[PDB]
Amino acid sequence: YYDIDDVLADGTEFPCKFQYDIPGLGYNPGRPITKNTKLSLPLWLARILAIVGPVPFVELLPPDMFSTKVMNAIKTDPVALDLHSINSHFFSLAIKWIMLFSEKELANVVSELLLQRAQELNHHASSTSTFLLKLEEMEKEIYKKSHESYKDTKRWMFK
Amino acid sequence: LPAHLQQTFSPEEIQFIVENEPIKIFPRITTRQKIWQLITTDDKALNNMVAMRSTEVVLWIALLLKQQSKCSIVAPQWLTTKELDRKIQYEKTHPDRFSELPWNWLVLARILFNKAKDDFHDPIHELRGKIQDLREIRQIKVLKGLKYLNESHLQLDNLSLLEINELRPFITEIMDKLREIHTASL
Amino acid sequence: NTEIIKSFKNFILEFRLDSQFIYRDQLRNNILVKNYSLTVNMEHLIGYNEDIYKKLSDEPSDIIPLFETAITQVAKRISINSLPTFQLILNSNANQIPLRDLDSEHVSKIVRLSGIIISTSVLSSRATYLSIMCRNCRHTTSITINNFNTGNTVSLPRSCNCGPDPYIIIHESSKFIDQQFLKLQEIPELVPVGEMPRNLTMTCDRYLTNKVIPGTRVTIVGIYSIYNSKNSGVAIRTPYIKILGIQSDVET
Amino acid sequence: MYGDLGNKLVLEAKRTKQLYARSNQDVNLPMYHEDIIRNILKEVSNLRKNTEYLKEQQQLGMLDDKVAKCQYFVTLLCMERNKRCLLAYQRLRTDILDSMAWNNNGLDLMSSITFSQQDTNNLSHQEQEYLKEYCDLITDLKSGDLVDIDLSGSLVPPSDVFIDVRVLKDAGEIQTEYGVFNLIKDSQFFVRQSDVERLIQQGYLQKI
Amino acid sequence: INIDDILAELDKEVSPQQDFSDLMKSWKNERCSPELLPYPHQLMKRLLNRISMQSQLIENISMGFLESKLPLLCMETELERLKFVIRSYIRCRLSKIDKFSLYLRQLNEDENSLISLTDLLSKDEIKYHDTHSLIWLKLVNDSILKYMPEELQAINDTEGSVNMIDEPDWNKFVFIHVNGPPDGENEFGKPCYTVTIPDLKEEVELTIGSIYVMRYEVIRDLLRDDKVAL
Known part of the structure; x- marks a missing residue:
């Protein structure tokens, strides 16, 4: 991690439950943490506890970010759907979720959402918009990398 | 540390590359001899010129001599109202291709029209009429050629050098996110 | 009716100031955003030709709907299915006509004026x-x-x-x-010392709706027209301004 | 409230990346935020206090327990998470101090300790000695090339050899190299671009 | 009936332009590739010995002359135009030492992958490389590693996370314009070049005319052999 977009992605919370019993909690009541207790963990922490354990410590239940509501709302209209309201980050997280789960049915949905928002950051980069409010924070980098390249070509062609 | 853009060419470094390709001039100072010399490193010939007899110099010298009016930039083969009409009617009857551009397509239409506007055949509504018309036909097929991008391969058969240096940081930042989904799912 | 399209169709394609020409770059950037309009500055008409503005200044009600079909034959030279009729929005600065002196002579003439907006209405069809x-x-x-x-x-x-x-x-x-049906009151610094401030009612077209909040200072370029509803006299009409192009200030 | 101080230092750093990005310089780097550093550095002293605490107790009471090996595997991690938020911040503050010593220091000044980077307070004691040695690393490079003495500036490509230079309100007749200029206010020139690039960067002659 | 060989004997009975076409070709290949390309160690001793030669000859003519001010302002223009290519070529590599400063030290403690260090780097960049990682470690050591436990002292390969290798990224999509000389060696067909064979796909067969967009890993061979250009 030297990139600041990579560090901030780990701080999100995931509703994951336990399997064993631990006599200590750095977080408070009742230092023996009973099993079948559900907590929300940061993704820097619940990413190495899902492997090291044959039974690992953490069950890693699926969130609402990839529930059937969101997976149905992005097959209807990928353009006018909010992505700044879910949390804030989508593409830096849904790559991390695929590697720890190896699901071949999510990678055929994000690869179609990404094409449909790609075709409308090339239209609006031709020099009065609401598309500064409903973009993903991974797309606001390439929007400021594209709109400041068309501007420096249209500047040069006319004096 | 350049740190401004650092991964593309800025469009003042594109008029630096196109100024290394030769054209023809009709000179107005002889300096041949009869029976002090330009001794530069990269060209080192054509000290010997005659008044009104064509020779071939590199382009960055022939903009020094136009500012003092000791030369006259000739037209290339494409700045012709008879020649650019075939390269337009090619574009309508073939909606998949790029017709043909001499790869100094946009850049040699800028440095000639601002500086050398006395040597063509009527640039008013005959050449700035076509060249803006041929940039708006061409910028439709680029926009329809991006609904079809994939994560392994692409073909862009005949594009200029300035229609690419506005299009690198869009494609290579999106196609680097379609690679990291297909190979992260495997 | 005939061939006055071609005298305007060449105006959009060929008008050009010093280096970068405007009405083929304002028509292209207003299609990618799906904006579907155009903004003609009215000084650039009479610099290019005077015979065009002579027709537009005399009888504007029959010629502006001929320029709206002269745009939609040009936007099919750029996009190549549903392209509607474009809308023409124009602005200029000659001389303000104050709201008090609008005689019977300005019927169907391009008139600009100023004032304060009182109220709005609900949209319609x-x-x-x-x-x-x-x-x-x-x-x-x-x-x-x-x-x-x-x-x-x-x-x-x-x-x-x-x-x-x-x-x-x-x-x-x-x-x-859509239609909008504003109302407009004259500025109180052209004081009616023995009168009350009058008012007029405008209409707006599809792309000027919901642009202005009640209580601002606007300048309005429109056609002073007339309509004859009975909703108090014999053979009496009523005046109203068909807005084509509202040049408000910075809203502040 | 366990690694929350990582999420307050990082979002603090994201502001400075977006003052450098769009159009403006990062003249006046904001401040060295130190009170959030001492709050992070207090907790890594406290998380060392437990891993030596369990080291004696695993040889007496626990006796190599696998559930007790989890605390060595959890308290190791929060050392990493606060290490990464403390290196992402002090690399980002480094490169802006790398660029500022690379654009407007050592350019027709040849010894510019003062007169540039006018804060000299928003940097720590350690970041103010890193910078001053780094400018002496540059002048080693410009002595073994001789392409040009101080190869630093002017990454704009050259064109239009003779330019017009208008004096903006700075008298002094200062220049001695390549001739005196006899500089008076509001009087424009016709000189070549080689002798003015050493003064067009000082905010001293306005026109190109 | 071919007379060209019989004409080719009829007439018979390093060049300074070609060096500038190679500096311009090696400069465009620099700014778009992710890895650090091997330095042209042999030609760039000539150009720094060609610049200092002529820069005296300008001073020797222009002082040694004192009606023709036109030749003295062409050579003054060209020298300050060849100077800009070098000043933006050397200063582009020094933005790629300051990202892979740590990955390159791995390539020296390893015995056998490619120990170049004299054709991978120049003479004075290694006076930059040693004295930069030293001066950056003395900043982190008094600001973080004063409060250092025994595990987390050094930063070379901190496995247990993604970090500290640096990834000279082998799958950035690049823009290539393929230009290979035909027979008049590895060309399969009349107009076209050989399969580039990625891991999962079919032939992705190049031609010699058109330009392409493809991964950097599969064409890493053909950039050494000067059959493509960026």
Whole structure:
């Protein structure tokens, strides 16, 4: 991690439950943490506890970010759907979720959402918009990398 | 540390590359001899010129001599109202291709029209009429050629050098996110 | 009617200041955002040709709906299915006519003025292109209205004999637009020492709706027209301004 | 409230990346935020206090327990998470101090300790000695090339050899190299671009 | 009936332009590739010995002359135009030492992958490389590693996370314009070049005319052999 977009992605919370019993909690009541207790963990922490354990410590239940509501709302209209309201980050997280789960049915949905928002950051980069409010924070980098390249070509062609 | 853009060419470094390709001039100072010399490193010939007899110099010298009016930039083969009409009617009857551009397509239409506007055949509504018309036909097929991008391969058969240096940081930042989904799912 | 399109179709393609020409770069950037309009500065018409503005200044009600179809034949030279009729929004600065002195001479003339907006209204629907079928013959047709002069200037015909007005509007295949119905009060610094401040009522087209909040200082370029509803005299009409282009200030 | 101080230092750093990005310089780097550093550095002293605490107790009471090996595997991690938020911040503050010593220091000044980077307070004691040695690393490079003495500036490509230079309100007749200029206010020139690039960067002659 | 060989004997009975076409070709290949390309160690001793030669000859003519001010302002223009290519070529590599400063030290403690260090780097960049990682470690050591436990002292390969290798990224999509000389060696067909064979796909067969967009890993061979250009 030297990139600041990579560090901030780990701080999100995931509703994951336990399997064993631990006599200590750095977080408070009742230092023996009973099993079948559900907590929300940061993704820097619940990413190495899902492997090291044959039974690992953490069950890693699926969130609402990839529930059937969101997976149905992005097959209807990928353009006018909010992505700044879910949390804030989508593409830096849904790559991390695929590697720890190896699901071949999510990678055929994000690869179609990404094409449909790609075709409308090339239209609006031709020099009065609401598309500064409903973009993903991974797309606001390439929007400021594209709109400041068309501007420096249209500047040069006319004096 | 350049740190401004650092991964593309800025469009003042594109008029630096196109100024290394030769054209023809009709000179107005002889300096041949009869029976002090330009001794530069990269060209080192054509000290010997005659008044009104064509020779071939590199382009960055022939903009020094136009500012003092000791030369006259000739037209290339494409700045012709008879020649650019075939390269337009090619574009309508073939909606998949790029017709043909001499790869100094946009850049040699800028440095000639601002500086050398006395040597063509009527640039008013005959050449700035076509060249803006041929940039708006061409910028439709680029926009329809991006609904079809994939994560392994692409073909862009005949594009200029300035229609690419506005299009690198869009494609290579999106196609680097379609690679990291297909190979992260495997 | 004829060939005045081609005298305007060459104006959009060929108008050009020093290096970068405007009305083929304002028509292209207003299609990618899906904005569907155009903004003509009115000083650039009379610099290019005077015979065009001579027709537009005399009889504006019959020529601006001819320029709206001269744009939509040019936007099919750029995009190549649904391209509607474009809208023309124009602005200029000659001389303000104050709101008190609007005689009977300025009927159907381009007039700009100023004032304070009192109130707005709720949006509505006006028809542009509708489909008609007869009740007995069932002979289908299509009436396309584009001109705007509020009650009725173009209506249904009387035969395709059959009865009095056998025609029905079919609501399943049409297109519609919006109207806004403002009101406008004169600025109180042109003081009516023994009078009350008067007011007028405007209309707005599809792309000027919901642009201005009540209580601002605007400048309005429009056609001073007339309409004859009975909603108090004999052969009396009523005045109203068909807005084409509201140049408000910075809203502040 | 376990690694929350990582999420307050990082979002603090994201502001400075977006003052450098769009159009403006990062003249006046904001401040060295130190009170959030001492709050992070207090907790890594406290998380060392437990891993030596369990080291004696695993040889007496626990006796190599696998559930007790989890605390060595959890308290190791929060050392990493606060290490990464403390290196992402002090690399980002480094490169702006790398660029500022690379654009407007050592350019027709040849010894510019003062007169540039006018804060000299928003940097720590350690970041103010890193910078001053780094400018002496540059002048080693410009002595073994001789392409040009101080190869630093002017990454704009050259064109239009003779330019017009208008004096903006700075008298002094200062220049001695390549001739005196006899500089008076509001009087424009016709000189070549080689002798003015050493003064067009000082905010001293306005026109190109 | 071919007379060209019989004409080719009829007439018979390093060049300074070609060096500038190679500096311009090696400069465009620099700014778009992710890895650090091997330095042209042999030609760039000539150009720094060609610049200092002529820069005296300008001073020797222009002082040694004192009607023709036109030749003295062409050579003054060209020298300050060849100077800009070098000043933006050397200063582009020094933005790629300051990202892979740590990955390159791995390539020296390893015995056998490619120990170049004299054709991978120049003479004075290694006076930059040693004295930069030293001066950056003395900043982190008094600001973080004063409060250092025994595990987390050094930063070379901190496995247990993604970090500290640096990834000279082998799958950036690049823009290539393929230009290979035909027979008049590895060309399969009349107009076209050989399969580039990625891991999962079919032939992705190049031609010699058109330009392409493809991964950097599969064409890493053909950039050494000067049959494509960026």
